[PDB]
Design a protein around this ligand. Structure first.
Ligand SMILES: [Cl-]
Ligand SMILES: [Cl-]
Lengths: 110, 110
């Protein structure tokens, strides 16, 4: 088995015309698993993932903080302990309006 | 999307000749997702999942507490923030030696 501390993984800052103030850690990656992968995202205060979509589903668990979820229309702010299923091709994004870091686990198929 | 509180899901107590003091919540189940599912397990103080295996892999994230992981040989106690990849057919189990509930997220393929 692989049994490791998530926060020991080196984060990558993500910075594009559509993403700001976000770090990503790959926990269980393509070389480790046969079917789906596990990542941990940290959203800084003011960070933003603009609405977008991919052709695969996402499964998310909110680990820390008040995550604002951008939906195909509108938004909803949720807290640690919420889970999210995002359909294939469903437009969605995220924002952190609070003064502390938000963390969420994200899993996607290979 | 599905956006819901994990702890609002009704738990099921699991009680067999190999499992004691464990509750299970299905968060994203077979009818919701195309490729893999997400469950949340709560291990009571003294709870125990005996060593066993399944022919699919598991991906686990420790949400709360000091989870003791039973390996194919021996054991290791780990804390919130650890992740686990369990290989197909790998013998493994879990125990809670502490005085408070332990929680972990578990995902498996369909
Ligand atoms: Cl970070
Ligand atoms: Cl419970």
């Amino acid at each position: 088995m692989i049994l490791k501390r998530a926060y020991d993984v080196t984060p990558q800052k993500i910075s594009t015309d559509k993403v700001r103030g976000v770090r990503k850690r790959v926990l269980i990656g393509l070389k480790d698993a046969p079917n789906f992968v596990m990542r941990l995202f940290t959203v800084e205060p003011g960070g933003l993932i603009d609405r977008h979509s991919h052709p695969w589903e996402h499964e998310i668990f909110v680990l820390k903080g008040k995550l604002t979820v951008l939906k195909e229309q509108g938004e909803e702010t949720v807290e640690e302990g919420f889970y999210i299923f995002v359909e294939p091709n469903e437009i969605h994004g995220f924002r952190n309006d609070t003064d502390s870091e938000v963390e969420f686990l994200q899993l996607i198929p290979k």
